[PDB]
Design a protein around this ligand. Structure first.
Ligand SMILES: CCCCCCCCCCCCCCCCCC(=O)OC[C@H](COP(=O)([O-])OCC(O)COP(=O)([O-])OC[C@@H](COC(=O)CCCCCCCCCCCCCCCCC)OC(=O)CCCCCCCCCCCCCCCCC)OC(=O)CCCCCCCCCCCCCCCCC
Ligand SMILES: CCCCCCCCCCCCCCCCCC(=O)OC[C@H](COP(=O)([O-])OCC(O)COP(=O)([O-])OC[C@@H](COC(=O)CCCCCCCCCCCCCCCCC)OC(=O)CCCCCCCCCCCCCCCCC)OC(=O)CCCCCCCCCCCCCCCCC
Ligand SMILES: CCCCCCCCCCCCCCCC(=O)OC[C@H]1O[C@H](O[C@@H]2[C@H](O)[C@@H](O)[C@H](O)[C@@H](O[C@H]3O[C@H](CO)[C@@H](O)[C@H](O)[C@@H]3O)[C@@H]2OP(=O)(O)OC[C@@H](COC(=O)CCCCCCCC[C@H](C)CCCCCCCC)OC(=O)CCCCCCCCCCCCCCC)[C@@H](O)[C@@H](O)[C@@H]1O
Ligand SMILES: CC(C)=CCC/C(C)=C/CC/C(C)=C/CC/C(C)=C/CC/C(C)=C/CC/C(C)=C\CC/C(C)=C/CC/C(C)=C/CC/C(C)=C/CC1=C(C)C(=O)c2ccccc2C1=O
Ligand code: HEC
Ligand code: HEC
Ligand SMILES: CCCCCCCCCCCCCC(=O)O[C@H](COC(=O)CCCCCCCCCCC)COP(=O)(O)O
Ligand SMILES: [Cu+2]
Ligand SMILES: [Cu+2]
Ligand SMILES: [Cu+2]
Lengths: 139, 58, 223, 186, 301
């Protein structure tokens, strides 16, 4: 998977160039100092792309060509076993409601509502994560 | 937004004019604002880019 | 001091003139006249942050103060020289009195509060709702001078208590009660807000019953 | 043979890359407030001690090793080694949190608060948001350790352990940047 | 014709405005050209390339043209380059700030009104000198154990400027600023609470009035080379500042160079603004704007 890796480092080069240009051009003939606000953002924008690019490069070097990365590939090559997907769940709405409660608490500065919201969020996330792992009832 | 909520609710000095915070907000906001207006442009370029070839027989 | 009466005038014409006028006579349908209100009103309104206001709604809220002590005094003195009125009590050093306003009799202050002040506020000085968009605030943030000057002026929809209706000895007892009822710990556990049946009911439903049902579900079976 | 990318890992990588831009705001505020300092950047009441921030940093740097050892145990099929190493990691993280809290109390006592100054605001905001991320990581440890005993140890559980390790290696790498930029570059 | 291609800009009253108008007109023409080209291209294919009644055999399937995507990517670069050059040329001129102005104005914006103060006057003919700075009154804005920001509380207000002659606006009287014609003018902008907008349309310019220009690394002082028109011109606020953002207008009245001295003397005697303009045969109140009704609106008795 080389195209995926290249797409990120292409951006990384431009971002690095832009950050370096902005930092220097501001140090001289620009009122004040180095304009720390805009300089900080671009030097982390480069990092965002760098992390993903490096990870993709390593993954691409690890594994060989896939049917997706092959020009003259057949449909019969990909036949087999995809994996696991959740068919249905009513937990997401509960998570959203919990977060909404916490947010409303934080907006009007009601600490009790914030605490209740945090407890609800933890419970809902626990419910979501422990969904396809609960065993049968023991009796 | 978290910084602004901190100022409003905890009485912090993040965006104080004396602190050089009138223009901190503008930098932080316009780093978001313009990429935001390009977020709602490209997908709708793609829609018309899909529609054009179909009705042109080309 | 005339050096203080002119520094308070230049602060006024830059911050107050839009809603109150250049001659303190009031701008129609925008703000009232400030003749005869005194420096007690100025102290209460500016120290608590209510002034300068930002828009015309049901009730002007409190917020962080705009000026400091020196500027507050300057503004108060400028206003006092334009029609008289009440004055903020001072101490032996000329500073605003805080400790000397605390009364000795808290039992008399308690039932004076219960008769005169517990209708709008709570039993112990929480909030209370009024007609339409208005309310009586929480009293846990005010200092003695602010509590004293609140009733001396009748700020917005709170009635006005003169020095003949409530003498400056009953006021001290009231402020003592207000300051004590806000800084005393709860006995018997977490205060639960201090409103009574409503927080108690919600705490019951959200803690006790949840725990009981959880325990029942653990002990019992399904299907 | 393995011939596919783990998408549970690529999802967490892209999210972790996005989460780096959240701290951009905090860094920008710090550097902006530092510029308008004039004289001494840490004001007169502020006195930073290296007698407490150094051991805590070392502990937070020793957690990664244990975390990676747990991950190494996960890839072999060992369910007990993972549990042992993750418990140790949790304890070290808790030590970090308690140390940071103690330092907060000490700093507040001497007159360095959020409404007190412009330095206090940025300091507490940055370090408090980092503490919040750490607490989230601890919660993740507890949830994963609770899940590891619900069912048989399948590859999916190993994947979950690996992604949690990724997250942890993102809370301690952003603290070596903060520590370097606060206590050394003053 | 400049009355149709300017898209309704006012004619300038200053050299900079007149220079800016030229660049605007030129840019509008250069944009309508490409607009017409592209519209013609779109219209051409929508009227001739259509489905015919006797039409089968789907058309030629071409989708690539190498020596046309490299040609059409070069012309816009050349178009924008010249525009960039002219933009730089004009922008460098509008921000010159000659060391020796002839009148300095202290403009302060507060919550929904203005105040103008004459800092200093020094004519080039050596026929009028005046120094209106007042540091004693300025000293009375200072705040302070340590302070939050650089050893002081947010209630400092030291950065403001105070002068001996100051026109102040009220909720019932539009503030009028009086300037001489044919003279170099300063404007030094400061704000007490929030950001405001200094716009005089006839100047073809505007600048933000900030609460701390120095601390925020932003220039808050511009010059006008000279004004060659006597009369009354409008100004209004162009930055969101609250409920009465739309109700804080002002006026600038430019008079003959000799009348300016008479007005200054009248103000020095102790007369107000309305009592000074009347002294030089001028209407006392604004003629471009009038005070807004103080009532909330037409649903109120
Ligand atoms: C001070 C104020 C704060 C506290 C006061 C209020 C809270 C009181 C808590 C009351 C809970 C009492 C539970 C007692 C039993 C605990 C012993 C135990 O291990 O039970 C095993 C039990 C599994 O055994 P089982 O009964 O045979 O269940 C059948 C199957 O195994 C499973 O079949 P299933 O498919 O039905 O399972 C689905 C369900 C199973 O979980 C439940 O049934 C939870 C019960 C909640 C009932 C609440 C009523 C809701 C009404 C709306 O899964 C979830 O809901 C996941 C949520 C995770 C639980 C929350 C984690 C705590 C976060 C802390 C905040 O699972 C649990 O109940 C454990 C969750 C309870 C957390 C206990 C933590 C102790 C401290 C209390 C919190 C403070
Ligand atoms: C704050 C205090 C304030 C005062 C309030 C009063 C506090 C009193 C607390 C009483 C709470 C209410 C009644 C519940 C009684 C709990 C009795 C109990 O179930 O334990 C016996 C328990 C019997 O459970 P069971 O009925 O057979 O449930 C089996 C279920 O069918 C199916 O379950 P399973 O066997 O398949 O396993 C699922 C899972 C249980 O399911 C869950 O984990 C539920 C989700 C909650 C976890 C999220 C916590 C929130 C994050 C913060 O198992 C686990 O417990 C996870 C173990 C690893 C967790 C810790 C790892 C991190 C290490 C850090 C050090 O036997 C054990 O497994 C040994 C664990 C007991 C030790 C921990 C208990 C705490 C003791 C505190 C004393 C001080
Ligand atoms: C299973 C078994 C059963 C379980 C039983 C549970 C009970 C556990 C109890 C543990 C406590 C033990 C010690 C004894 C109590 C104690 O020693 O007392 C401390 C003091 O404390 C308060 O003083 C605050 C300051 O200290 C003062 O400086 C300040 O003055 C004061 O201000 C008041 O007074 C001013 C003067 O006028 C006013 O200006 C001002 O407005 C205000 O009124 C302060 O009060 P306050 O604002 O209440 O906030 C306090 C702080 C912190 O408090 C503390 O220290 C300790 C607090 C301990 C409480 C522990 C309770 C456990 C609950 C969980 C944490 C919540 C999660 C549950 C959700 C569901 C479960 C999951 C499914 O914030 C919080 O987080 C509050 C706690 C939040 C949780 C409690 C209940 C939430 C219920 C949710 C309902 C909503 C549902 C919505 C659905 C839509 C006042 O009470 C004082 O009297 C009191 O003296
Ligand atoms: C008949 C009548 C009076 C009804 C009025 C209905 C009404 C208009 C309600 C408005 C409530 C709110 C939240 C107003 C703000 C505007 C707003 C955001 C509206 C909802 C928007 C919306 C639909 C969004 C999505 C939904 C969502 C994410 C959640 C909403 C937030 C929630 C769930 C909050 C409401 C819960 C609620 C009203 C509970 C109050 C009940 C009680 C008894 C509280 C009183 C109480 C007090 C006062 C304490 O001090 C206290 C202190 C310590 C412990 C406990 C308590 C305690 O319980
Ligand atoms: C400049 C900083 C000031 C000062 C010193 C004060 N104000 Fe205001 N104010 C406005 C309105 C509509 C009211 C009446 C309703 C209410 O009280 O909210 C007030 C009230 C006052 C008072 C109370 C006087 C009384 O009669 O007891 C005082 C002492 C006061 N103000 C001082 C409106 C405005 C306003 C327009 C939006 C502006 C600006 C200010 N106020 C500013 C100031
Ligand atoms: C109903 C009307 C009442 C009565 C009988 C009392 N108060 Fe209170 N009060 C009321 C309102 C609507 C307001 C808000 C006005 C404003 O914000 O402009 C207030 C305000 C106060 C305050 C100041 C707020 C603070 O800073 O917390 C205090 C200290 C106060 N009121 C106290 C008080 C006392 C001691 C009273 C009886 C003696 C009293 N009030 C009566 C509403 C009402
Ligand atoms: C609003 C988001 C801001 C989060 C920043 C995290 C702050 C870390 C705590 C550090 C303690 C320092 C306190 C101090 O010196 O000043 C203290 C005041 O600070 C606080 O009250 C902090 C409470 C913040 C709430 C915690 C997080 C909010 C949860 C929201 C979830 C959605 C004391 O100052 P003072 O005595 O008034 O001078
Ligand atoms: Cu844009
Ligand atoms: Cu304005
Ligand atoms: Cu405006």
């Amino acid at each position: 998977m080389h195209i995926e890796a290249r797409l990120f480092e292409i951006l990384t080069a431009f971002f690095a160039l832009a950050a370096v240009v902005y930092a220097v051009l501001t140090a001289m003939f620009a009122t004040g100092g180095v304009e720390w606000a805009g300089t900080t953002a671009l030097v982390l924008t480069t990092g965002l792309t760098l992390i993903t690019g490096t990870f993709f490069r390593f993954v691409a070097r690890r594994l060989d060509t896939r049917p997706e990365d092959y020009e003259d590939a057949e449909i019969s090559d990909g036949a087999g076993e995809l994996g696991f997907f959740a068919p249905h769940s009513w937990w997401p709405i509960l998570i959203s409601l919990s977060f909404s409660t916490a947010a409303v608490g934080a907006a009007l500065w009601l600490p009790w509502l914030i605490a209740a919201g945090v407890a609800f969020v933890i419970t809902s996330v626990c419910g979501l994560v422990f969904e396809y792992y609960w065993g049968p009832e023991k009796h | 937004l978290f910084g602004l909520a901190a100022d409003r609710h905890l009485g912090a000095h993040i965006y104080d004019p004396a602190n050089g915070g009138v223009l901190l907000w503008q930098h932080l906001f316009w780093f978001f604002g313009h990429p935001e207006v390009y977020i709602i442009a490209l997908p709708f370029f793609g829609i018309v880019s899909e529609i054009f070839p179909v009705f042109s027989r080309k | 001091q005339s050096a203080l009466l002119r520094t308070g005038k230049q602060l006024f014409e830059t911050s107050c003139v839009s809603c109150h006028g250049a001659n303190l006579q009031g701008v129609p349908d925008r703000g009232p006249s400030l003749i005869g209100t005194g420096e007690a009103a100025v102290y209460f309104q500016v120290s608590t942050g209510r002034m300068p206001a930002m828009r015309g709604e049901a009730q002007a809220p409190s917020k962080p103060p705009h000026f400091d002590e020196s500027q507050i005094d300057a503004l108060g003195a400028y206003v006092q020289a334009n029609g008289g009125g009440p004055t903020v009590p001072r101490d032996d050093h000329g500073a605003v009195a805080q400790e000397s306003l605390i009364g000795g009799d808290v039992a008399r202050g308690g039932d004076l509060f219960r008769l005169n002040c517990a209708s709008c506020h709570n039993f112990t000085g929480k909030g209370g709702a009024l007609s339409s968009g208005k309310y009586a605030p929480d009293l846990g943030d005010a200092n003695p001078a602010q509590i004293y000057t609140a009733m001396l002026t009748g700020p917005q929809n709170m009635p006005k208590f003169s020095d003949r209706q409530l003498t400056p000895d009953e006021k001290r007892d009231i402020v003592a009660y207000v300051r004590e009822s806000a800084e005393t710990p709860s006995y018997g556990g977490y205060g639960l807000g201090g409103f009574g049946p409503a927080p108690e009911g919600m705490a019951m439903w959200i803690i006790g019953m949840v725990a009981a049902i959880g325990v029942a579900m653990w002990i019992g079976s399904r299907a | 043979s393995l011939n596919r990318p783990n998408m549970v890992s690529v999802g967490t990588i892209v999210w972790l890359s996005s989460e780096l831009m959240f701290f951009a705001g905090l860094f920008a505020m710090y550097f902006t407030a530092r510029a308008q300092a004039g004289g001494a950047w840490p004001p007169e009441p502020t006195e930073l001690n290296l007698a407490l921030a150094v051991p805590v940093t070392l502990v937070l740097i020793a957690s990664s090793f244990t975390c990676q050892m747990g991950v190494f145990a996960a890839e072999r099929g060992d369910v007990f080694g993972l549990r042992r190493w993750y418990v140790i990691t949790f304890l070290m993280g808790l030590f970090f949190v308690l140390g940071q809290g103690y330092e907060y109390i000490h700093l507040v006592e001497h007159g360095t608060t959020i409404p007190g100054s412009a330095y206090g605001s940025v300091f507490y905001l940055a370090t408090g948001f980092h503490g919040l991320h750490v607490i989230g990581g601890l919660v993740a440890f507890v949830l994963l350790l609770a899940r590891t005993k619900m069912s048989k140890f399948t590859p999916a559980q190993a994947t979950a352990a690996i992604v949690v390790s990724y997250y942890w290696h993102f809370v301690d790498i952003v603290w070596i940047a903060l520590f370097a930029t606060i206590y050394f570059v003053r | 014709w400049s009355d149709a291609l300017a898209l309704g800009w006012p004619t300038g009253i200053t050299p900079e405005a007149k220079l800016n108008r030229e660049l605007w007109i030129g840019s509008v023409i250069a944009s309508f050209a490409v607009g017409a080209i592209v519209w013609g291209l779109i219209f051409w294919t929508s009227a001739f390339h259509r489905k015919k009644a006797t039409d089968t055999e789907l058309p030629r399937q071409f989708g690539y043209n190498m020596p046309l995507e490299l040609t059409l990517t070069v012309i816009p670069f050349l178009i924008i380059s010249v525009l960039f050059y002219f933009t730089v040329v004009v922008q460098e001129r509008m921000m010159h700030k000659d060391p020796n102005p002839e009148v300095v104005i202290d403009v302060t914006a507060f919550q929904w009104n203005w105040k103008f103060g004459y800092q200093k006057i020094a004519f080039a003919d050596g026929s009028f000198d005046y120094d209106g700075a007042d540091p004693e009154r300025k000293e009375a804005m200072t705040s302070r154990k340590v302070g939050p920001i650089r050893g002081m509380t947010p209630e400092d207000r030291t950065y403001l400027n105070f002068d001996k002659i100051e026109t102040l606006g009220t909720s019932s009287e539009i503030p009028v600023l009086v300037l001489p014609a044919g003279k170099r003018i300063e404007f030094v902008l400061n704000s007490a609470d929030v950001i405001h907008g200094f716009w005089v349309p006839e100047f073809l310019f505007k600048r933000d009035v900030l609460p701390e220009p120095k601390a925020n690394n932003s220039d808050n002082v511009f010059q006008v080379s000279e004004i060659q028109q006597t009369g009354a011109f409008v100004g209004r606020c162009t930055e969101m500042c609250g409920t009465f953002h739309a109700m804080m207008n002002f006026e600038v009245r430019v008079v003959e160079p000799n009348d300016f001295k008479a007005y200054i003397d009248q103000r020095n005697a102790g007369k107000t603004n309305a009592e000074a303009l009347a002294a030089i045969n001028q209407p006392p109140l604004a003629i471009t704007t009038e005070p807004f009704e103080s009532r909330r609106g037409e649903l109120v008795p």
